Amino acid sequence: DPRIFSILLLRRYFTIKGVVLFVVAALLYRINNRNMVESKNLYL
Amino acid sequence: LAAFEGPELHRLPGGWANVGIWILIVITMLMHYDSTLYLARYSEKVVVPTAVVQFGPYRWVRHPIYASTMLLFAAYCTALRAPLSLLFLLAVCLVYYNKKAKMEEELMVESFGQSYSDYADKVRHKFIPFVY
Amino acid sequence: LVDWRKVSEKTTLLRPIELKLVPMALESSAFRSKFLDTDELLSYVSWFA
């Protein structure tokens, strides 16, 4: 129910804490799609 | 039959084509929960309704619990992208659910009098919205 | 749709500020007749708010 979010949203530390987890999640997702060996053939 | 007629496992795509099963599963869970809650918030005992429920999915369809079970059936069958098994599942579940819906509908018609009659006149579609 | 003559004959003992607050209470009592649930109305009210 959007009101459940909205009551807490309408009520400096929290934003920075939430944006740190944003760049950490971005890092983990970006590292997640690449194979550790990009060139299997050139190392083969 | 959905398992077998469906293709081999890791070849089905991803990306933006796997959002449909997400939203359909969310819809069937939401509609089933609403149907069960609206059916259980009025009955005194386990299944003993007092008034007629005509709220939530009941104002779109006469049997939303059965159609939600139907829709998660279709969700599993559509996750593996097999239309024919979805159709046969639809046929058999339509037959049995329609039989059981007919007995329960005549029971509440007999038991409640005009109330369920006008409720059924308000919403005719028994299983699928404006299809059945 | 409301014949206000008979409503005036039903509010003879009343006062102008209550004569002003009559219509919304009248609509509420009109909505009282049908059969409806609290939580659906509450959900719609929350969504619209």
Tokens (6 digits) for A33: 């799609």
Residue numbers after which chain A breaks, C to N beyond 2.5 angstroms:
11
Please indicate if any CB of chain B lies within 8 Å of the CB of C38: no
Q: What is the dihedral of CA B72, B51, B54, B67, to 10 degrees?
A: 20
Exposure b/e, C22-46, CB count within 10 A at least 16 = b = beeeeeeeeeeeeeebeeeeeeeee
Listed resolution, Å: 3.3
CA distance A3 to chain C (A): 7
Distances (CA, A) of B108 to A37, B120, B127: 67, 11, 17
Q: Could you give the CA distance from residue B52 to residue B122 in angstroms, rounded to a whole number?
A: 12
Q: Could you give the CA distance from residue A33 to residue A24 in angstroms, rounded to a whole number?
A: 15
Interface test with C, best of B42, B53, B55 (most C CBs within 10 A): B55
Pure H helices in chain C: 4-10, 16-31, 38-48
DSSP chain B: -HHHHS--GGGS--TTTTSHHHHHHHHHHHHHHHHHHHHHTT-SSTT--SS---SGGGGT-S-HHHHHHHHHHHHHHHHTT-HHHHHHHHHHHHHHHHHHHHHHHHHHHHHHTHHHHHHHHH---SSSTTT-
Residues 6+ apart with CB under 8 A from B34: B56, B57, B64
